[PDB]
């Protein structure tokens, strides 16, 4: 029972990773796993994605200012 649920969850995680790769979403594995747990527990994916994009753009801007 629990083993079957764990196998289903691991298959779901692998399928989500495959879907992200096919969509070229460019989301890391740790980031995807944290966002998956956050969305299951209850959080706005749009807000989380906006914050992640803001952090990525801040990193790119910091690299540009370094250059």
């Amino acid at each position: 029972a629990a083993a079957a649920n764990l196998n289903a969850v691991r298959e779901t995680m692998d399928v989500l990773l495959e879907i992200s790769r096919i969509l070229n979403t460019g989301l890391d594995m740790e980031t995807l796993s944290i966002c998956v747990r956050l969305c299951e527990q209850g959080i706005n994916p749009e807000a989380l994605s906006s914050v992640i994009k803001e952090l990525r753009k801040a990193t790119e801007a910091l690299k540009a200012a370094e250059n």
Binding site: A1, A3, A4, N7
Partner: protein, 444 residues
């Protein structure tokens, strides 16, 4: 005293075998399909208490529990004429008609998940039977419920009744025919393991042999699963003819098991019918001698077991029991034993007790016999070691090539690896080696 047997039907093939056996028992005991005893069987010599459980309606109801995870076989059993013959309370039908998916691991999971319902029906049948002797599990070795649920039912019957004989009418898969389930090899191995471990004795009913025997001996072109179930029902009625009609020898399942199984573990039995011919094959004024019957039964065209004709495994009968239905002269039986011994009509295992018994018993009066001498052969032969080796090799081929391994590994029995299938193939290989030893002088 009556000795009721709890007929547990698992899978489609098992449900067909159980329903056909119940119909044959009702016909031989003269119990109508409604269970109201047929008018001709009120004074019948059939030990209806012995074979069938007496319900509140006095219906000659065999203690049969039909437990299947697919609703098709359950509906067909409930739609048979004998629906009122058996007790409805002993039939547990899983509303999830998805079955075990031809996976023995999934079948065992289904049997354990319906263990409360199925074990409830088994215990109800045991309490409803005065001297319930054990359980007979009719299932298919290649199916999921038949193999897996068959293993689960055999284990459950052994655990609830460790002192009760666990007989299995396991439909062995076609080792020479490409099974439609690539995991059917693993399912067959698991059913064989169930027969060896959670079942006290396994009668391998190889569907390939059923088709071959029906086509060649009975001239039945392409025997269907329905045909195999009907043949199983006829063979069961022949074996229970002495059960309904009280004879002088082999009056119980334990006695037959003892006379046919010199090794407690090596109780896997191959099947044969004699004379093997269609009912339209009327033996023209042919007085079937007991020796002639022995020769015809020993003829491979009359054996109902798909034992690989493996020249490596020296097939020999560990024990040979000839169940004769009809008017058979006991002096002719003794002459048959002498003639069969002289002509070597039957080859016996070199490492098992020589058991050639000639017992005269009556058939069920409600069961009409077209042949004055009808013969059912239950022989422990090392050719079953050939069939077991074929099944084990198929199981190894499925496990090693991951054939239908998605279905096999989807169940908890094989969740970590194909451990259930591997242990099943190991048990089948051990049984095959022991059976070949039994035909060899070195088994003891």
């Amino acid at each position: 005293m009556p000795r009721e047997i709890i007929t547990l039907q698992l899978g489609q093939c098992g449900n067909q075998i159980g329903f056909e056996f119940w119909k044959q028992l009702c016909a031989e005991h003269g119990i109508s399909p409604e269970g109201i005893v047929e008018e001709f069987a009120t004074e019948g010599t059939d030990r209806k208490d012995v074979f069938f459980y007496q319900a509140d309606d006095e219906h000659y109801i065999p203690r049969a529990v039909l437990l299947d995870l697919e609703p098709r076989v359950i509906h067909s059993i409930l739609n048979s004429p004998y629906a009122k013959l058996y007790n409805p309370e002993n039939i547990y039908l899983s509303e999830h008609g998805g079955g075990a998916g031809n996976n023995w691991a999934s079948g065992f999971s289904q049997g354990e998940k319906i263990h409360e319902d199925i074990f409830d029906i088994i215990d109800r049948e045991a309490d409803g039977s005065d001297s319930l002797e054990g359980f007979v599990l009719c299932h298919s070795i290649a199916g999921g419920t038949g193999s897996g649920l068959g293993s689960y039912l055999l284990e459950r019957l052994n655990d609830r009744y460790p002192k009760k004989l666990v007989q299995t009418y396991s439909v062995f898969p076609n080792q020479d025919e490409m099974s439609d389930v690539v995991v059917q090899p693993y399912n067959s191995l698991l059913t064989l393991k169930r027969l060896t471990q959670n079942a006290d004795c396994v009668v391998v009913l190889d569907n390939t042999a059923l088709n071959r025997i029906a086509t060649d001996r009975l001239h039945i072109q392409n025997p269907s699963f329905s045909q195999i179930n009907q043949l199983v029902s006829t063979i069961m009625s022949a074996s229970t003819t002495t059960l309904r009609y009280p004879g002088y020898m082999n009056n119980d399942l334990i006695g037959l098991i003892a006379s046919l199984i010199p090794t407690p573990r090596l109780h896997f039995l191959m099947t044969g019918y004699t004379p093997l011919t269609t009912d339209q094959s009327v033996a023209s004024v042919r007085k079937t001698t007991v020796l002639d019957v022995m020769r015809r039964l020993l003829q491979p065209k009359n054996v109902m077991v798909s034992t690989g004709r493996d020249r490596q495994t020296n097939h020999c009968y560990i024990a040979i029991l000839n169940i004769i239905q009809g008017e058979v002269d006991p002096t002719q039986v003794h002459k048959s034993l002498q003639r069969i011994r002289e002509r070597k009509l039957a080859n016996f295992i070199p490492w098992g007790p020589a058991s050639i018994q000639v017992a005269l018993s009556r058939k069920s009066p409600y069961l009409p016999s077209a042949h004055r001498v009808s013969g059912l052969m239950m022989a422990n032969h090392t050719s079953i070691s050939s069939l077991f080796e074929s099944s084990c090799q198929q199981y190894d081929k499925l496990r090693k090539r991951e054939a239908f391994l998605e279905q096999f590994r989807k169940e908890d029995i094989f969740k970590e690896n194909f451990d259930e299938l591997d242990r099943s193939r190991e048990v089948v290989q051990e049984l095959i080696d022991e059976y070949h030893a039994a035909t060899r002088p070195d088994y003891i």
